[PDB]
Design a binder for these strands. Structure first.
Lengths: 49, 160, 98, 62, 49
DNA sequence: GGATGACGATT
DNA sequence: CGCGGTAGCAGTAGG
DNA sequence: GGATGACGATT
DNA sequence: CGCGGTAGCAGTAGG
């Protein structure tokens, strides 16, 4: 339920929220490929999946 | 970078050996230069804190231009990001950042002493280095790798 | 992670020496690193390309160091033979390069 | 300002003796967040916000 | 030939060398999962594959 | 009137 | 370069 | 005596 | 979670 159903307030599932939090931690005003951003976020957000 | 077919293992080993040696001489030389640069840097930082303590130099107020002028009129060399000096008088010419940049802490006797110690140590390094041939350094690295390698074998046998 | 022994083989001090490849307006890995002992003989390699192929078997590091000393002392080299870590078999030469 | 008017001297004077002066002049401490302390480690904050500043600051322009 | 055949001096194929260079740029004295290290290296070594 | 499939984050 | 398997719910569509 | 497969970095 | 396809070379093994 936690990982599939979003929170009413931002409308995020924990994955998405980790992604965005990651994009805020880093200065994502300049692009980078997905296959890198994903691992980055995973690392700095304690993503075990 | 020219593809090559080696006819013997020892041919490979040799062609490695020589280049390596050359780059050990090269290595020693570079380390030497860098070190000298560091010694000069430290030295001038010391001259700068010292001249401020003896009250021979005042930075309080005095717009940065007028300060720069004083600095280059006292013989102080500039320093770029790498660490290379300049005495000719941008990255090409270096800045006085190595002396106005330093934390106000430096201006406390304790920091001053630490600085001195660091200088002396740097010089000691330089001297120890100049007292070695390429094959010497290479040898040291080798023995270190012998110890490390023994330990490595131990660990590897341990995990299997 | 890095093996504690890695930074013993590829000495940090030599880093400033290597010519670093300029790619995409940005600096990238050197053309080649220069370990304190040839690694290509320590691990060997296998590779298939175009026109050219390559296979080089592993060798015992100790032997390599021994010969490096030999060269360091203008002494005749010993001949080496394929050696594998933790392997408990036997290897016999049949023809030079075999 | 107190350094310019020559009312406060940091040149030499081992950091302890300086700290004492600072907390005897009313100067509050500051931790990493930016929270002050006037009570007199991360809990109590340090004078780093004032000895830490680049010597540059001491030029009229800064 | 460049990407498949190693250089006699270190015995690296450009991929491997990029990996190690990456591990030197970062302080890899503390572990991290492969699926992150790979993208990291790729990013800081201009790896287009 | 029962069965199959869509959607999505994870194995 | 690319393809495939499974859970879990609510409701829609297909025979 | 011709065919198939292993090895490895990349699609 | 997992499986599969192709290039390119040198030499070995299988029928």
């Amino acid at each position: 339920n936690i990982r599939s159903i979003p929170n009413v307030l931002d409308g995020f599932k924990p994955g998405q929220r980790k992604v965005l939090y990651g994009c805020f931690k880093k200065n994502l005003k300049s692009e980078l490929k997905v296959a890198q951003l994903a691992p980055y976020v995973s690392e700095c957000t304690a993503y075990h999946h | 970078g020219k593809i090559k077919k080696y006819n013997s293992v020892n041919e490979i080993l040799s062609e490695f050996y020589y280049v390596r040696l050359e780059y050990y001489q090269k290595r020693k030389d570079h380390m030497s230069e860098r070190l000298q640069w560091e010694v000069e840097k430290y030295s001038f930082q010391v001259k700068f804190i010292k001249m401020i303590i003896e009250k021979e130099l005042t930075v309080t107020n005095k717009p940065r231009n007028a300060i720069i002028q004083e600095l280059e009129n006292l013989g102080f060399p500039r320093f770029n990001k790498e660490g290379k000096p300049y005495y000719g008088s941008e990255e090409l010419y270096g800045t006085y950042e190595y002396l106005l940049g330093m934390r106000i802490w430096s201006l406390t006797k304790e920091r001053y002493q630490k600085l001195l110690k660091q200088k002396q140590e740097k010089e000691t390094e330089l001297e120890n280095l100049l007292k070695l041939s390429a094959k010497d350094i290479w040898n040291t690295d080798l023995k270190a790798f012998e110890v490390g390698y023994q330990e490595f074998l131990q660990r590897d046998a341990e995990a299997r | 992670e890095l093996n504690k022994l890695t930074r013993k083989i590829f000495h940090p001090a030599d880093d400033p020496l290597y010519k670093y490849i300029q790619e995409d307006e940005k600096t990238v890995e050197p053309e080649w690193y220069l370990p304190i002992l040839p690694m290509i003989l320590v691990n060997g390699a296998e590779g298939i390309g175009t026109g050219w192929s390559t296979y080089i078997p592993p060798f015992n590091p100790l032997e390599i160091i021994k010969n490096i000393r030999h060269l360091m002392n203008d002494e005749e080299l010993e001949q080496m033979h394929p050696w594998f870590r933790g392997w408990t078999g036997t290897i016999e030469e049949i023809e030079p390069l075999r």
